[PDB]
């Protein structure tokens, strides 16, 4: 199929109306970031020739 | 198509697999980059049919209904101004869908300010949103409201100058 | 940068070869429509909110903070006066209460 970018939402814009929140949600989200790799060392002489 | 060449090439091992894997990683990385830049909203926002924004004109940045590509005049100008075993993979997001993402972002930032980026899109009149932005930079709301026509005229003139500068600079 | 929504705080957690950030953010919810105006016209003067926004539930005008609905009476303590009512486009007529008035009334 052709993908859908997002659910359609038409904001009810007018020149004299505002939307004010009456409540809130405390949302906790995860962010995973790599920091380091495995520290590898290669003996060049031993690898090529043994 | 040489069989003898491929037989001799097999003696060197998995070099070809390494090169193909690296190119595949680059190819998926480009799509990931496009997702990270443009696909930051999960709601496709649309502008109201009546473009009453208190004097502010966004025709040069909103999509043109007359054009089949649904691009803005600025985006149309930008697209016009950019001109043996190899294959070119198409991008995952086509140009019209990227333009649709930019249109959704423009509609969200015009009709809702910064509210849509932090949660549900809350409608606010555009002069009031501009007044909020004025307060963000330490200028009182009254300055924006008293000089609203001047600010709208300056904004429209600057947007037109942007289009002229892009059309006039190689 | 620190999660989706208005960022409140964050917690670090160690991970094998990495870090996991638990971003605690504030998300607005249960929004409600109100009729809004840029300024309030009172006594030939234009009143603008110091920190909030003018809202109307249909009959009465209040001032509230922008990110949470908490309607309060429009007074001189939460509004400031700049200019007359002839310049601001969309200014509406409403009274502005004065806290000092009952003090010299009594
Ligand atoms: C704001 O939303 C919270 C939910 O996060 C509402 O709390 C709920 O209230 C109902 C009815 O009192 C309870 O049955 C739920 O168990 C509550 N949920 C939680 C997590 O406490 C709160 O009432 C809402 N406030 C307003 C004014 O709408
Ligand atoms: C917003 O700006 C656009 C473009 O500057 C205006 O469109 C122009 O309208 C005049 C009068 O109808 C035409 O002579 C021009 O040729 C139009 N320009 C283009 C590029 O189409 C538009 O009128 C402005 N105002 C609104 C409310 O959209
Ligand atoms: C604020 O008012 C607008 C318009 O009065 C509401 O938008 C309507 O929402 C209904 C339900 O989704 C739709 O069927 C209508 O087509 C919408 N109208 C327009 C012009 O978009 C909006 O939902 C109201 N918001 C709140 C929080 O009450
Ligand atoms: C808008 O809110 C105000 C304040 O809450 C409402 O005024 C109150 O209405 C109740 C219902 O009759 C009265 O008992 C109170 O005495 C009123 N307060 C004041 C200060 O007059 C007003 O009715 C609300 N309007 C709408 C359309 O809901
Ligand atoms: C808001 O109040 C102002 C002033 O009280 C009103 O302006 C008056 O309008 C009448 C008729 O339009 C004129 O005869 C007066 O001379 C005006 N006075 C001033 C000081 O300008 C204004 O019309 C009111 N607006 C609404 C919507 O009621
Ligand atoms: C909103 O637009 C209407 C016309 O559509 C106008 O009568 C009204 O005064 C405008 N209000 C503001 C606050 O600009």
Curated annotation (Swiss-Prot), chain B:
Glycosites: 57
Record site feature (Cleavage), residues: 71-72
Domain of life (superkingdom): Viruses
UniProt effect for mutating residue 52 to Y: In strain: 19B/501Y, Omicron/BA.1, Omicron/BA.2, Omicron/BA.2.12.1, Omicron/BA.2.75, Omicron/BA.4, Omicron/BA.5, Omicron/BQ.1.1, Omicron/XBB.1.5, Omicron/EG.5.1
Function noted in UniProt: Precursor of the fusion protein processed in the biosynthesis of the S protein and the formation of virus particle. Mediates fusion of the virion and cellular membranes by functioning as a class I viral fusion protein. Contains two viral fusion peptides that are unmasked after cleavage. The S2/S2' cleavage occurs during virus entry at the cell membrane by host TMPRSS2 or during endocytosis by host CSTL.
Protein name (record): Spike protein S2
Coverage span on the entire protein: 745 to 942 of 1273
């Amino acid at each position: 199929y052709t993908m859908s970018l997002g659910a359609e939402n038409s904001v009810a814009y007018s020149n004299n109306s505002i939307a004010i929140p009456t409540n809130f949600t405390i949302s906790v989200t995860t962010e995973i970031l790599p920091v380091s790799m495995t520290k590898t060392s290669v003996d060049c002489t031993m690898y090529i020739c043994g | 198509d040489s069989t003898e060449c491929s037989n001799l090439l097999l003696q060197y091992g998995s070099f070809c697999t390494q090169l193909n894997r690296a190119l595949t990683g680059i190819a998926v990385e480009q799509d990931k980059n496009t997702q990270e830049v443009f696909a930051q909203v999960k709601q496709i926002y649309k502008t109201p049919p009546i473009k009453d924004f208190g004097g502010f004109n966004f025709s040069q940045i909103l999509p043109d209904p007359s054009k089949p590509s649904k691009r803005s005049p600025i985006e149309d100008l930008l697209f016009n101004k950019v001109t043996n075993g190899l294959t070119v993979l198409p991008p995952l997001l086509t140009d019209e869908m990227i333009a649709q993402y930019t249109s959704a972002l423009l509609a969200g930032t015009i009709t809702s300010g910064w509210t849509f980026g932090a949660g549900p899109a809350l409608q606010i009149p555009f002069p009031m949103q501009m007044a909020y932005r004025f307060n963000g930079i330490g200028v009182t709301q009254n300055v924006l409201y008293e000089n609203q026509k001047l600010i709208a005229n300056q904004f429209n003139s600057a947007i037109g100058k942007i289009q002229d500068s892009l059309s006039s600079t190689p | 940068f620190c999660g989706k929504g208005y960022h409140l705080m964050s917690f670090p957690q160690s991970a094998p070869h990495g870090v996991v950030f638990l971003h605690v953010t504030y998300v607005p919810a249960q929004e409600k429509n109100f009729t809004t105006a840029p300024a309030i016209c009172h006594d030939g003067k234009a009143h603008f909110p110091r920190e909030g926004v003018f809202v109307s539930n249909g009959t009465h005008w209040f001032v509230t903070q922008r990110n949470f609905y908490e309607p309060q009476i429009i007074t001189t303590d939460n509004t400031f006066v700049s200019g007359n009512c002839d310049v601001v486009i969309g200014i509406v007529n409403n009274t502005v209460y004065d806290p000092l008035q009952p003090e010299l009334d009594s």
